[PDB]
Write a protein that binds this DNA or RNA. Structure first.
Ligand code: MG
Ligand code: MG
Ligand code: MG
Ligand code: MG
Ligand code: ZN
Lengths: 154, 59, 305, 99, 115, 110
RNA sequence: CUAGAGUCCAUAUCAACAAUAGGGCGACCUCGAUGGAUCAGGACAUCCCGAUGGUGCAGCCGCUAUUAAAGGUUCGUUUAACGAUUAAAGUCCUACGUGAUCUGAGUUCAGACCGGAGUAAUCCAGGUCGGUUUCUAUCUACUUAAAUUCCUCCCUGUACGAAAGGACAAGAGAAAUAAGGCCUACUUCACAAAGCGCCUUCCCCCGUAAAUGAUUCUCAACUU
C-alpha cells in the first residue's frame, strides 16, 4: 500500500537517495544540461526547481548559504548559483527547467531523459512544436473563432 | 399449463429436489410444493432432463 | 490507424479558444436547467404509503466533529451534491422488473474523454457528461422528468439514509490483513512461517472448498452502509452531514438514497415528494437546516440541568 | 463540590428495616411525578450493613449505626480535607534510595 | 488498560493496601468479557497472599476526550459485596462513576477530591 | 516440488504462442519533419538529439580548454561564437567561446 | 419386558435377570524415501441460545422428554489435577483432520551416568543428560449484501408464595464478540497506513396447542 507516498525508493537508502540526487543536481548546475534515467530526472527536478528559490534569497542570507553548501559538492558552483543562475531567473517565478524524453540507452534499454536549465548557452534541443496555425483544422477553428467573435460584438 | 400439473399420491409433499451450490454448507433440499410455488415450470424441466440421453446433445 | 486526442492538431492560438468555448457551453447548459417547474414538468403526485422516491449522488469531502445538546460528540461525513441531474426514465414494463427505475448522474467531467455513444446521449439531453451513473428503484408516482436538477435539500435533518460507494482498494494482501488470521509466533523455532495461511482444508476431501479465505486483492468493491441519519444540511453549498463514516476515499462519488431498514420504513410522509423544487417553492430555505438535538455553532454554550 | 445538592444519612435497626425504607421511598418517587428523569436503582442490595440510593440531585446512604461510626461521613461532607482521618494519613513520600 | 499480571496502586487508607516492602499487588483476573479494564471496572487482586476484589478508578492508558488521564494506575479495594475496604480516598478520582452503571455511590461518598 | 509428467508440445504451443505473449504493434511511430528519420510521438528524435549532443560536446571541450582547471567555474554568462562573428551589443562582460566552425542553421543566434 | 426402588404408587425419575435393534483378532494394500500453533469442513447421539409436552412443576431454581446444528462454546500453574471466570466452557468423524504450512515428545540411533543382568563382549516395556532430512509448484482444486449474546432498569418487589423468597411477556439503556467500513479527534505516526480509536449491522422456523366434525385437533373431508 503506497497512497500519498511522493518519494521514490532509489539507491541503497534515504542517505544514498539524497546523495544520488545531490550528484545529479551538482552536474546539472555545472554543465547546465545532463542526461540520466527518467525516474531519477523526475525526482531531481523538484530539488533543481527549489535551488533557484534559495538562490534568489541572496548569498548574504545565512539559510541559503548553508543549503547551497550542502547541495553543491563543488564549492566553485556556489558563486555561480548566486551570481549567474539567480540573476537570470529574477523575472521568472517558475518553470526554470524543462524535461524531455530521449531514446532508451543501448546498455540496458532504460528509460532515459534530459533535463536542462532554461536560458543556457548550449545549442537548443529539438523541442516538440505544436501544429502551425496555417493548417486545415486550425484555419477552420480560426474561422469559427472570428464568426463567433463578430456575433457577440454586434 | 405446466402450473396445473398433477402428482399421483403424496408426491407434492414427499418428493424433494436437492441441489448444491458448491460452497460449504450449501446443500439445499426443497419439496415439489416449494419448487412449484417458486418456479411453476421447474418440475417439467427437470423431469425431461433426467430422461434425455446423458451426452453433449442433451443441452 | 493511429490514436489521437482532442488537442493533437491544435495550434497555440486555438487551444485557449477551444478550452473556454467548451467551458462556456458547459456552464450555459447547466444554467438552462435551473427552472424545472416551468419547462413543462411531469405531474406531481401526493405522497402515499409504500412509495419510493429517487436518491442522490454526492462527493465525499471530509469529516468534522459535531456535538449535541445532550453533550455527546458524533463525527459526520461531508457529502456535497454537485451537478446532480436525472438522465432518463424507464417504466416498469420496459424494465421487466417489479418497480420502475430512474437514472441519475453527477460530477460533470470533460467531454474529450468520453465515448462517442455517451457523448451523443448527453447531446440530446442538453447536459454535460457525468462521471458516474446510478439506477434508483422508484414507483410510478415518483417519476421525474429527465433534465431536472437535484439538490441536497431533497433530504431533511432527522432522516436516515443509505450510502453505497467503492471502498478504498488495497491491492494484493495476505491472510492476516485480508481475513484477520492470527498468524504464527515470531520465535521459538518458527521457520519462514509468520504470516502464512497454514492449513487450507482437510486431507480426506483432496480438494479446496470454493470460497476459501485465501490471499488476494482487497477493496475496490461496492459496499453499502445502512442506518445513517442526517444531522445537518447546508443549503448554499448543497452539503449533507451524514452520521458516522462512509465507504470510499476523499473526493469519491457516493450514491445516497433513503434507508431500507424495516424500522425506518414509512418515514417519508413529511419528506419532499418526489423531490425539492427551489424554483417553485413559496419560501426560501434557511442557510443551514439543523437537527433538534444539534447545538448550533452560534448558540450559547450548553449548560446542563 | 461537583457531586450533588443534598446528602442524606439514615440509620436503621435491622437489615429488613433499611430495605423497607429503600422500597418505600423509590415507590413514591416513581409513582408521584417526574416522568422525564430516568429511574433510580437501589445500590447495595447484597451489602447488609450499607445501602444507598442516588437520585438526580439527592443521595441517601442507609447504613447501620455501627457502620456509621466505622464509616464517618458527616465531617467529611462538612470539612473538606480537614477531617481527623484525612489529617491522620501521611502525605506522598516518593520513597528515597537506600544507603 | 489493566489486565492480568498488571501492577496497580492502591489509593485508599486500607491496612491491607499498605505494603511495608513497597511491593505493588498485581491483578490476576478482570471481570469483563474481553479482559480489558477501563475506568470503573471491577477486577481481582492477589495482595499479601489474599485474593481481594478491587475497583479501578484511574489508568495510565488514554481515554476519551475531556476525561482526566492519570499517570499511574489507581485502584480501590472493596468487599465481596460492594463495601469499600478502606475508609477514605486521598488521591483525586474521576467523576465519571456517576454516569457509569454500577455500585459507585459508596466510593464517591468516601472520596474527597474530584477531577 | 517436481513435475509429475512431461508437458506435451501441444500444451507448450498454447502457452508460448498466447496472444498476450506476442509483441504488440506500436502505433505511435512517425517520421521526423526535419531529418526524415523515424521517431516516437513522445520521444525526441534520435538523429536530432544525437547531433545536438556532439555539438554540445565540442563546445564543452572548448569550455574546458579555455577553462584550464577544475573548481574555476566563471561567475559570468557564457555565449558561444562561430567563425565570422562579432560580439553583440547585449553580449558584454560575458565569457566568449570560439568555435572553428560555421554556425548551424538549427542553432539560431539570439 | 414390569421384578424391585421412589412414604402410598411400575412407568415424576431410577432400575435387576433377560430380550430386540443400531454405531465403529485378521495380515487384504504400502519394505525401489503424537501434543501444540494456524486454518478449519461435516454429523447430532444438543454444553449454551430458541419453541413445546410431563413432573414428587406454588413462584424462583431443578429433573425428564420432543423439535431445532442459523449462532456461540474463556484465560492461567504444573506435567489430568485446581485457580479464576462464563448464557456454555459438548460428544465425535475428518489418514495426529491438517508437518512439500510450522513446531514440543514418543516409536530409537551414533556419546555418557546411576540401579539391575551377564565371566566377558554387551543388554534392560527402570531413571537421566545431549543429539541434522531437503524441496525453485508440473497437473487437479481454490484465491471479495439478513448478528448474536450477557448485564442493568421498567413492568415489579407485580403474579405466585403464610413467610422465606421471587418471575413472566412487551419496552428502554449499556456492554462484549462477530461481519462490513473509516481517519474528525486519541495513539503508533504524519501529503499516508494502522489500532489501542470511531461508525453501521435488517427474515421465519412448525415440537405442539386448540374449533367444527363423520367411519374425537383430521396419515377423514376441514378452521386457527
Ligand atoms: Mg489503492
Ligand atoms: Mg435431536
Ligand atoms: Mg501434507
Ligand atoms: Mg476491522
Ligand atoms: Zn529528426
Amino acid at each position: 500500500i503506497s497512497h500519498g507516498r511522493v518519494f521514490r525508493r532509489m539507491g541503497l537508502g534515504p542517505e544514498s537517495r539524497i546523495h544520488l540526487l545531490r550528484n545529479l543536481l551538482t552536474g546539472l548546475v555545472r554543465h547546465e544540461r545532463i542526461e540520466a534515467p527518467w525516474a531519477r530526472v523526475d525526482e531531481m527536478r523538484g530539488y533543481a526547481e527549489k535551488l533557484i528559490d534559495y538562490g534568489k534569497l541572496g548569498d548574504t542570507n545565512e539559510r541559503a548559504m548553508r543549503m547551497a553548501d550542502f547541495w553543491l559538492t563543488e564549492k566553485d558552483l556556489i558563486p555561480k548559483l548566486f551570481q549567474v543562475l539567480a540573476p537570470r531567473y529574477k523575472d521568472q517565478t517558475g518553470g526554470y527547467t524543462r524535461m524531455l524524453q530521449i531514446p532508451n540507452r543501448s546498455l540496458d534499454r532504460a528509460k532515459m531523459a534530459v533535463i536542462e536549465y532554461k536560458g543556457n548557452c548550449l545549442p537548443p534541443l529539438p523541442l516538440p512544436r505544436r501544429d502551425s496555425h496555417l493548417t486545415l483544422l486550425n484555419q477552420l477553428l480560426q474561422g469559427l473563432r472570428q464568426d463567433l467573435r463578430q456575433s457577440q460584438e454586434a | 399449463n405446466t402450473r396445473h400439473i398433477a402428482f399421483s399420491g403424496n408426491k407434492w409433499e414427499q418428493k424433494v429436489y436437492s441441489s448444491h451450490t458448491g460452497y460449504p454448507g450449501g446443500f439445499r433440499q426443497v419439496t415439489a410444493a416449494q419448487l412449484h410455488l417458486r418456479d411453476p415450470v421447474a418440475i417439467v424441466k427437470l423431469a425431461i432432463y433426467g430422461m434425455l440421453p446423458k451426452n453433449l446433445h442433451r443441452r | 490507424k493511429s490514436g489521437t486526442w482532442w488537442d493533437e492538431h491544435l495550434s497555440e492560438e486555438n487551444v485557449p479558444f477551444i478550452k473556454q468555448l467548451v467551458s462556456d457551453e458547459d456552464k450555459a447548459q447547466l444554467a438552462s436547467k435551473l427552472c424545472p417547474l416551468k419547462d413543462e414538468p411531469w405531474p406531481i403526485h401526493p405522497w402515499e404509503p409504500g412509495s419510493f422516491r429517487v436518491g442522490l449522488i454526492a462527493l465525499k469531502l471530509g469529516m468534522m466533529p459535531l456535538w449535541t445538546k445532550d453533550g455527546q460528540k458524533h463525527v459526520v461525513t461531508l457529502l456535497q451534491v454537485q451537478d446532480c441531474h436525472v438522465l432518463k426514465y424507464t417504466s416498469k414494463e420496459n424494465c421487466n422488473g417489479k418497480m420502475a427505475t430512474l437514472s441519475v448522474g453527477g460530477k460533470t467531467v470533460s467531454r474529450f474523454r468520453k465515448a462517442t455513444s455517451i457523448l451523443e446521449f448527453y447531446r440530446e439531453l442538453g447536459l454535460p457528461p457525468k462521471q458516474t451513473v446510478k439506477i434508483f428503484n422508484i414507483t410510478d408516482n415518483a417519476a421525474i422528468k429527465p433534465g431536472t436538477p437535484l439538490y441536497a435539500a431533497h433530504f431533511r435533518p432527522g432522516q436516515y439514509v443509505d450510502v453505497t460507494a467503492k471502498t478504498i482498494g488495497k491491492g494484493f494482501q495476505g491472510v492476516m490483513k485480508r481475513w484477520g488470521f492470527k498468524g504464527q509466533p515470531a520465535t521459538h523455532g518458527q521457520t519462514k512461517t509468520h504470516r502464512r495461511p497454514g492449513a487450507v482444508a482437510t486431507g480426506d476431501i483432496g480438494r479446496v472448498w470454493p470460497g476459501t479465505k485465501m490471499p488476494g486483492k482487497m477493496g475496490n468493491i461496492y459496499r453499502t452502509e445502512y442506518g445513517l441519519k442526517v444531522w445537518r444540511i447546508n443549503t448554499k453549498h448543497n452539503i449533507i452531514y451524514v452520521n458516522g463514516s462512509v465507504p470510499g476515499h476523499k473526493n469519491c462519488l457516493v450514491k445516497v438514497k433513503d434507508s431500507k431498514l424495516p424500522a425506518y420504513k414509512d418515514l417519508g410522509k413529511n419528506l419532499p415528494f418526489p423531490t425539492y423544487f427551489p424554483d417553485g417553492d413559496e419560501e426560501e430555505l434557511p442557510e443551514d437546516l439543523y437537527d433538534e438535538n444539534v447545538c448550533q455553532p452560534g448558540a450559547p454554550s450548553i449548560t446542563f440541568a | 463540590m461537583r457531586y450533588t445538592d443534598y446528602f442524606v444519612i439514615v440509620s436503621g435497626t435491622s437489615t429488613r428495616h433499611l430495605h423497607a425504607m429503600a422500597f418505600y421511598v423509590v415507590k413514591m418517587y416513581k409513582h408521584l411525578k417526574c416522568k422525564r428523569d430516568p429511574h433510580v436503582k437501589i445500590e447495595g442490595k447484597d451489602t447488609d450493613d450499607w445501602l444507598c440510593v442516588d437520585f438526580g440531585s439527592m443521595v441517601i446512604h442507609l447504613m447501620l449505626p455501627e457502620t456509621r461510626e466505622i464509616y464517618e461521613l458527616e465531617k467529611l461532607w462538612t470539612l473538606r480535607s480537614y477531617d481527623d482521618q484525612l489529617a491522620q494519613i501521611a502525605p506522598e513520600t516518593v520513597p528515597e534510595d537506600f544507603i | 488498560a489493566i489486565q492480568k499480571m498488571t501492577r496497580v496502586r492502591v489509593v485508599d487508607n486500607s491496612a491491607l493496601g499498605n505494603s511495608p516492602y513497597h511491593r505493588a499487588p498485581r491483578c490476576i483476573h478482570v471481570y469483563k468479557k474481553n479482559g480489558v479494564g477501563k475506568v470503573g471496572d471491577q477486577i481481582l487482586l492477589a495482595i499479601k497472599g489474599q485474593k481481594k476484589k478491587a475497583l479501578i478508578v484511574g489508568h495510565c492508558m488514554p481515554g476519551p476526550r475531556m476525561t482526566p488521564r492519570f499517570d499511574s494506575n489507581n485502584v480501590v479495594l472493596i468487599e465481596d459485596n460492594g463495601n469499600p475496604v478502606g475508609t477514605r480516598i486521598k488521591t483525586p478520582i474521576p467523576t465519571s462513576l456517576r454516569k457509569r452503571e454500577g455500585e459507585y455511590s459508596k466510593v464517591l461518598a468516601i472520596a474527597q477530591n474530584f477531577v | 516440488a517436481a513435475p509429475k509428467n512431461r508437458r506435451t508440445i501441444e500444451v507448450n504451443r498454447c502457452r508460448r504462442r498466447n496472444p498476450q505473449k506476442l509483441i504488440k504493434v506500436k502505433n505511435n511511430i512517425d517520421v521526423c519533419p526535419e531529418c526524415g528519420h523515424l521517431k516516437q510521438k513522445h520521444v525526441l528524435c534520435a538523429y536530432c538529439y544525437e547531433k545536438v549532443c556532439k555539438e554540445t560536446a565540442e563546445i564543452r571541450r572548448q569550455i574546458g580548454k579555455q577553462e584550464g582547471g577544475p573548481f574555476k567555474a566563471p561567475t559570468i554568462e557564457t555565449v558561444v561564437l562561430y567563425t565570422g562573428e562579432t560580439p553583440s551589443e547585449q553580449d558584454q562582460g560575458k565569457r566568449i567561446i570560439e568555435r572553428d566552425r560555421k554556425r548551424p542553421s538549427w542553432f539560431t543566434q539570439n
